[PDB]
Design a protein around this ligand. Structure first.
Ligand code: 1XF
Ligand code: 1XF
Ligand code: 1XF
Length: 215
């Protein structure tokens, strides 16, 4: 496998977004993975609409949480997802207002990484593109992260409470990491990103609920 991967350097990753007071991290994670596949397939990088997912994925709970796999299935069965420009993010729940004229991507299904398998996650990032993952982001240590490779041995791999996007991996001064795009704005972390420990016993459950869309 490649020793390091960073899809930001390939033009597969849109700017960091800010979910606001709505618990829609799952929707941001899902749009990020769809954005990466759309760029890889077509050469177009475009912001896709997390609001489309928040309002329209009936199997999820809007601002109360959701699964990325349900989001991918919705895009597949709906035969589309809007661009952000066609369906802007408002950070609150509302009726589904999907508009097929603003459709910007389709999905042919989704794939899951075997639970707990960081090597498989690394293979997916290398061969597929950015991957949607869920983690335990509840610790104040995560909340106040600024730089370096984040590792907290007290993180719980079974407490998956936040969804983010794995856009790469590498090693910094001997510490293997995942490059993670969050949705807490650019003023959080390192310009909106965090490096999370890799191959440290599935730290924070990073490989427990990982998936990507087919396009
Ligand atoms: N709660 C609602 O109003 S249904 C919104 C909507 O567009 N749903 C859908 C539309 C197309 C395909 C799948 C779904 C789904 O819910 O899974
Ligand atoms: N390019 C990819 O998505 S590989 C992801 C994946 O599911 N990998 C795997 C799945 C099952 C077993 C082993 C692996 C492995 O990669 O070692
Ligand atoms: N306690 C905290 O503020 S965690 C750090 C942070 O910037 N969080 C956030 C930033 C932007 C939007 C949402 C959140 C959130 O926590 O839900």
């Amino acid at each position: 496998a490649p020793d390091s991967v960073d899809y930001r350097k390939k033009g597969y990753v849109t700017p960091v977004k800010n979910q606001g007071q709505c618990g829609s991290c799952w929707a941001f994670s899902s749009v990020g993975a769809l954005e990466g596949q759309l760029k890889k397939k077509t050469g177009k990088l475009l912001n896709l609409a997390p609001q489309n997912l928040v309002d329209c994925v009936s199997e999820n709970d809007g601002c109360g949480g959701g699964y990325m796999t349900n989001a991918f299935q919705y895009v597949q069965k709906n035969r589309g997802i809007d661009s952000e420009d066609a369906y802007p993010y408002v950070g609150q729940e509302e009726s589904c207002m999907y508009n097929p004229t603003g459709k910007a991507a389709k999905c042919r299904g989704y794939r899951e990484i075997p639970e707990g398998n960081e090597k498989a996650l690394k293979r997916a990032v290398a061969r597929v593109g950015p991957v949607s993952v869920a983690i335990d982001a509840s610790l104040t240590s995560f909340q106040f992260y600024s730089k370096g490779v984040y590792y907290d041995e007290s993180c719980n791999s079974d407490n998956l409470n936040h969804a983010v996007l794995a856009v790469g991996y590498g090693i910094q001064k001997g510490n293997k990491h995942w490059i993670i795009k969050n949705s807490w704005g650019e003023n959080w972390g390192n310009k909106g990103y965090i490096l999370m420990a890799r191959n440290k016993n599935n730290a924070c459950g990073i490989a427990n609920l990982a998936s990507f869309p087919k396009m």
